[PDB]
């Protein structure tokens, strides 16, 4: 039995950015609630936008428009930068 969390990945990216910093468990649960909340926000907005575009699939175009909707524009263009980086580094399926 387990509960799905992202404390290991948060600690990994935090030590990757700055290894000389720590984080307690209460703030870890707060950030886990935060990432589940924004995942719920983006997923429901993408489902709304897919149902509005007469298309019952989820591509990356709806996610791009959804992160252009709810995120601010500097974070929106940084998010499309990170997303294009993720697709271009994932497409090399060798």
Interacting residues with DNA (CB under 7 A): 1, 55-57
**Dihedral pair phi/psi, residue 55, rounded to 5°:** -145, 115
Of 1 and 74, CB closest to DNA: 1
- Please state the closest distance from residue 6 (CB atom) to DNA, in A: 12
Name the residue nearer to DNA (CB basis): 21 or 56: 56
Shortest CB 45 distance to DNA, Å: 18
DSSP 39-68: HHHHHHHHHHHHHHTT--S--HHHHHHHHH
């Amino acid at each position: 039995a387990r509960k799905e969390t992202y404390s290991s990945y948060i600690y990994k990216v935090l030590k990757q950015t700055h290894p000389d910093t720590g984080i307690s468990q209460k703030s870890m649960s707060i950030l886990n609630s935060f990432v589940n909340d924004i995942f719920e926000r983006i997923a429901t907005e993408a489902s709304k936008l897919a149902a509005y575009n007469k298309k019952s699939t989820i591509s990356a175009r709806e996610i791009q428009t959804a992160v252009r909707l709810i995120l601010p524009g500097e974070l929106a263009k940084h998010a499309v930068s990170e997303g294009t980086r993720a697709v271009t580094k994932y497409s090399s399926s060798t």
